[PDB]
Design a protein around this ligand. Structure first.
Ligand SMILES: Nc1ncnc2c1ncn2[C@@H]1O[C@H](COP(=O)(O)OP(=O)(O)OP(=O)(O)O)[C@@H](O)[C@H]1O
Ligand SMILES: [Cl-]
Length: 321
C-alpha cells in the first residue's frame, strides 16, 4: 500500500490509463528542420531540430519499428504529465507520409554529459537539482505514474539556464494496486531490490531507490554506486553495503523465497556505515544532511522508503527559493 497516491488511477476515468485504446493524430513532419544527431537509444535516434513555424528549438526522437503498444503508452504518459515541474514537454507527434516512420517532437534541453557536468557542480548545485528531480517525481506519482528508469542518463541539465528535465518516459507505467509489473526494467545499477528479488507488486517507491543510487553516486563521487557484474551480483553489491539482516527481514515480511542461485553467492554482511564511502575528493559535498537523506532512500523495504513529497521537506534543502 503506497503511503501516497495509491488510488490515483482508481478515481481517474479509464481513458486516462487505457493507452492501447488511444487514437493518435500524427502530423506532417515538414515544419521540423532536422539537424545534428544528439542521442542514440535502444529503438530511437534523437536529433537537434527546429520548429520553423513556431520559432522554437526541439529534440526530434525518430522511432525504430516498435509495437504501437509501447509508443501509445509513452505518448499517453507524456500527455498526462504536460506542465509538470521539470518534466519534458511533448510538443508534437509526427509521421513521415512515405516511410510511415513515427517521430516524437520534444522541447529541446541543451544537455552536457553528466560525466563532464556533475564534477563541475557545487554543494548548492546538487542541492537544487536533486530538489527539482524530487518535484518531477512527486508530480508523476500524484498523476498515478512510475518513471521506472531514473538514472543520471535520463536527467537533462542546461546548467547555464538552471533548466532541468526528467526524460525517457518509454519505460514509465501507470500504478494500479494489485497489478504485477515487469521486474525487467531500469539499469541494473539503479534497479531496486524488489526488481532483483522478483517482487512484481512494486510501486512508486522504485523511483526513490533509483534516485537514492543517483544521489549516493553524485555526493560519494562513485557512479554507478552499486556496480554488479550480473542481476544476482547486483543484490550482493547492495547487501555488502545495507547488510543482510535487513534483507532477510525484508524477504520474510513480503514472503519472498530467493532463487537456488542467490543462496550460494549471498553471504552474511554487516551494514557498512555511510562514513566508509568518504574520500579526500568528496568530504566537501558528502556532509551529514545529505547522508541522512541517502539513508532514508536506500532502504530494502520499499514501503519504508521516504516519499519525494517528504524528501523535499528534509533540512538538506533549505529552499526559501
Ligand atoms: N529533449 C531532449 N533534449 C536533449 N537531449 C535529448 C532530449 N530527448 C532525448 N535526448 C537525448 O537522446 C538520448 C536518448 O533519448 P531518450 O532517452 O528519450 O530515448 P530512449 O527512450 O532511450 O529510446 P527508445 O525508447 O526508443 O529505446 C538521451 O539520452 C539524450 O541525450
Ligand atoms: Cl542483467
Amino acid at each position: 500500500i503506497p503511503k501516497f497516491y495509491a488510488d490515483v488511477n482508481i478515481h481517474k476515468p479509464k481513458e486516462y490509463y487505457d493507452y492501447d485504446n488511444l487514437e493518435l493524430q500524427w502530423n506532417k513532419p515538414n515544419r521540423y528542420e532536422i539537424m545534428k544527431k544528439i542521442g542514440r537509444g535502444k529503438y530511437s535516434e534523437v536529433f537537434n531540430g527546429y520548429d520553423t513555424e513556431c520559432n522554437r528549438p526541439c529534440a526530434i526522437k525518430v522511432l525504430k519499428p516498435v509495437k504501437k503498444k509501447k509508443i501509445k503508452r509513452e505518448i499517453k504518459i507524456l500527455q498526462n504529465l504536460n506542465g509538470g515541474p521539470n518534466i519534458i514537454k511533448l510538443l508534437d507527434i509526427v509521421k513521415d507520409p512515405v516511410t510511415k516512420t513515427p517521430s516524437l517532437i520534444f522541447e529541446y534541453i541543451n544537455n552536457i554529459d553528466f560525466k563532464t557536468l556533475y564534477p563541475k557542480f557545487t554543494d548548492k548545485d546538487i542541492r537544487y537539482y536533486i530538489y527539482q528531480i524530487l518535484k518531477a517525481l512527486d508530480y508523476c506519482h500524484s498523476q498515478g505514474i512510475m518513471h521506472r528508469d531514473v538514472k543520471p542518463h535520463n536527467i537533462m541539465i542546461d546548467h547555464e539556464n538552471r533548466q532541468i528535465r526528467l526524460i525517457s518516459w518509454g519505460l514509465a507505467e501507470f500504478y494500479h494496486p494489485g497489478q504485477e509489473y515487469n521486474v525487467r526494467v531500469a539499469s541494473r545499477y539503479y534497479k531496486g531490490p524488489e526488481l532483483l528479488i522478483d517482487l512484481q507488486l512494486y510501486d512508486y517507491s522504485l523511483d526513490i531507490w533509483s534516485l537514492g543510487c543517483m544521489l549516493a553516486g553524485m555526493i560519494f563521487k562513485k557512479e554507478p554506486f552499486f556496480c554488479g557484474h550480473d542481476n544476482y551480483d547486483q543484490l550482493v553489491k547492495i547487501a555488502k553495503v545495507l547488510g543482510t539482516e535487513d534483507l532477510h527481514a525484508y524477504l520474510k515480511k513480503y514472503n519472498i523465497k530467493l532463487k537456488p542461485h542467490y543462496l550460494n553467492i549471498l553471504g552474511e554482511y554487516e551494514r557498512k556505515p555511510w562514513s566508509h564511502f568518504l574520500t579526500q575528493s568528496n568530504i566537501d559535498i558528502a556532509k551529514d544532511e545529505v547522508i541522512d537523506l541517502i539513508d532514508k532512500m536506500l532502504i530494502y523495504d520499499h514501503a519504508k522508503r521516504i516519499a519525494p513529497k517528504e524528501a523535499m521537506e528534509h533540512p538538506y534543502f533549505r529552499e526559501v527559493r
